């Protein structure tokens, strides 16, 4: 599959799909999330009656925060990839004021919501999710893509209880090294913090943070201010809840490894250092891929368009100016 996958991806990467629907083809139902330049809304595609999640970004706000290239990355990558645990982009378009991405609606809510409410996940429930990320990072990294924003907030749970990765704002196709200070503080690898130049290994570090956080219910480095988190990441040592298994600790010690010649996922054996670790001894990797494993948790679902696995957000009307904004900047979107 990984052979056929790069071929398919490069074709879409090189000739991206553009302008494949219009705003007026969608009824706007409810906000499912926000960010600094817009929001994701539940919508219904009037023609098919299907529900989707629509991300709306304000072009002027994106320019203000100098995120043009990152938003062009997000859509170009998302329209080109294809994997069971990546949210599927269905349509993309833009108008005078906004950018739109219409994706699968993933009705189970964010892992974030379930994780905070429950406290923490059991090692088997955490492992189930971690396996899916391992495979998604194997796929992405095979295409020279770094994800750079792994966290429970970006992992949506579908009706089958499997993960769908969303929010590709910091994803970037890079061979070799890149330098942008970006990500979420709790999940940043030390090399990002230290402005060294860094590569796909930052995703493997982040996987360590996510596993820790799933299993403990809090992340390995927290504090009230980002800068204090950074200091812990760089100069501090990881300590584990007494309930962590010896195998979980050994895995996390190898993922939350400052030294790049020693970090799992960055060795010559690559992803298999992780796949063949004892913590994953119960994981049938092909069965996870094919979604044949019974999920440990299945969200409550009461028909489509139901949003009770999501928080409520203040609604505001989508405004579209009569004058085109930032046309040049977003030409290729």
């Amino acid at each position: 599959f990984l052979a056929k996958a790069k071929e398919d991806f490069l074709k879409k990467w090189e000739n991206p799909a553009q302008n494949t629907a219009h705003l007026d083809q969608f009824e706007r139902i409810k906000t499912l999330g926000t960010g600094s330049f817009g929001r994701v809304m539940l919508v219904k595609h009037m023609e098919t009656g299907n529900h989707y999640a629509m991300k709306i970004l304000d072009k002027q706000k994106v320019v203000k925060l100098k995120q043009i290239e990152h938003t062009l990355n997000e859509k170009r990558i998302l329209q080109a990839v294809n994997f069971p645990f990546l949210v599927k982009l269905e349509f993309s378009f833009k108008d005078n004021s906004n950018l739109y991405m219409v994706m699968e609606y993933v009705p189970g809510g964010e892992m974030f919501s379930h994780l905070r409410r429950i406290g923490r996940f059991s090692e088997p429930h955490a492992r189930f999710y971690a396996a899916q990320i391992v495979l998604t990072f194997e796929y992405l990294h095979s295409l020279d893509l770094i994800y750079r924003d792994l966290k429970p907030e970006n992992l949506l749970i579908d009706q089958q209880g499997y993960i769908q990765v969303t929010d590709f704002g910091f994803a970037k196709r890079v061979k070799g090294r890149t330098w942008t200070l970006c990500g979420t503080p709790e999940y940043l690898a030390p090399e990002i913090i230290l402005s060294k130049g860094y590569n796909k290994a930052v995703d493997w570090w982040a996987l360590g943070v996510l596993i820790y956080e799933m299993a403990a219910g809090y992340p390995p480095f927290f504090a009230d201010q980002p800068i204090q988190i950074y200091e812990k990441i760089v100069s501090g040592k990881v300590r584990f809840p007494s309930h962590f298994s010896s195998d979980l600790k050994d895995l996390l010690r190898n993922l939350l490894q400052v030294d790049l010649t020693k970090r799992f996922g960055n060795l010559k054996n690559g992803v298999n250092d992780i796949k063949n670790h004892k913590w994953f001894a119960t994981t049938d990797w092909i069965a996870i891929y094919q979604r044949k494993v019974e999920a440990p948790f299945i969200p409550k679902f009461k028909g489509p368009g139901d949003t009770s696995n999501f928080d409520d957000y203040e609604e505001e009307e989508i405004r579209v100016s009569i004058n085109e904004k930032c046309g040049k900047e977003f030409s290729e979107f």
Binding site: L65, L181, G217, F222, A223, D224
Partner: peptide, 20 residues
Amino acid sequence: TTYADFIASGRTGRRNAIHD
């Protein structure tokens, strides 16, 4: 407890990305 320290911290909600 570490749990108590987390719950009392300002980082238990949805975390934003950073850009410089």
